[PDB]
Design a binder for this molecule. Structure first.
Ligand SMILES: COCc1cc(C(N)=O)no1
Ligand SMILES: [Cl-]
Ligand SMILES: [Cl-]
Ligand SMILES: [Cl-]
Length: 163
């Protein structure tokens, strides 16, 4: 475990993370995809061997000794708000199980279902709150990655609010 488990946020490419493992915002078919998933494919392509997994699950594949946790959030274009919310919460619960099983002291994680799977809605708060629900009981240092300057400020504020 980390000596004083923390949350932090950084605005940069998650493929340049300084953590002991990474969470990919994967598609269910283990395809290279776009956004976070394409960056992850370019950096760790060996981790896409048999990485296909259903919505609401996470599947870990090693790139050398570096773990890539493929977490599949729902595409809110296809799911109802209700069913999508349940699957987005479940994906993060499976991430916490994998992070625990791997024994890592730190994890880089993107906000699942906030990009092309968002169904055109701002889901910062929804996705971040499901992240916290899952990861609060783990003792890994969590570093959240994003692209947008306004999102960095809002994620930082939400972390600081809990102290
Ligand atoms: C905010 O989604 C766009 C995005 C983020 C990234 C990344 N590499 O973290 N690539 O595309
Ligand atoms: Cl960058
Ligand atoms: Cl997304
Ligand atoms: Cl972002």
């Amino acid at each position: 475990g980390a000596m004083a488990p923390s949350y932090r946020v950084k605005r940069m490419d998650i493929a340049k993370n300084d953590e002991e493992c990474v969470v990919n915002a994967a598609n269910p078919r283990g395809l290279p995809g776009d956004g976070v998933c394409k960056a992850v494919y370019k950096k760790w392509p060996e981790s896409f061997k048999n990485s296909a997994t259903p919505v609401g699950t996470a599947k870990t594949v090693m790139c050398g000794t570096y773990p890539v946790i493929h977490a599949v959030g729902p595409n809110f274009s296809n799911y109802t708000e209700s069913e999508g919310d349940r699957e987005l919460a479940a994906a993060y619960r499976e991430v916490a199980k994998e992070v625990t099983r791997l024994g890592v002291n730190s994890v880089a994680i993107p906000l699942l279902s906030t990009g092309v799977y968002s169904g055109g809605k701002d889901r910062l708060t929804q996705s971040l709150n499901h992240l916290f629900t899952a990861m609060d009981s783990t003792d890994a240092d969590v570093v959240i990655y994003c692209r947008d300057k306004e999102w960095e400020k809002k994620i930082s504020e939400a972390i600081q609010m809990r102290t």
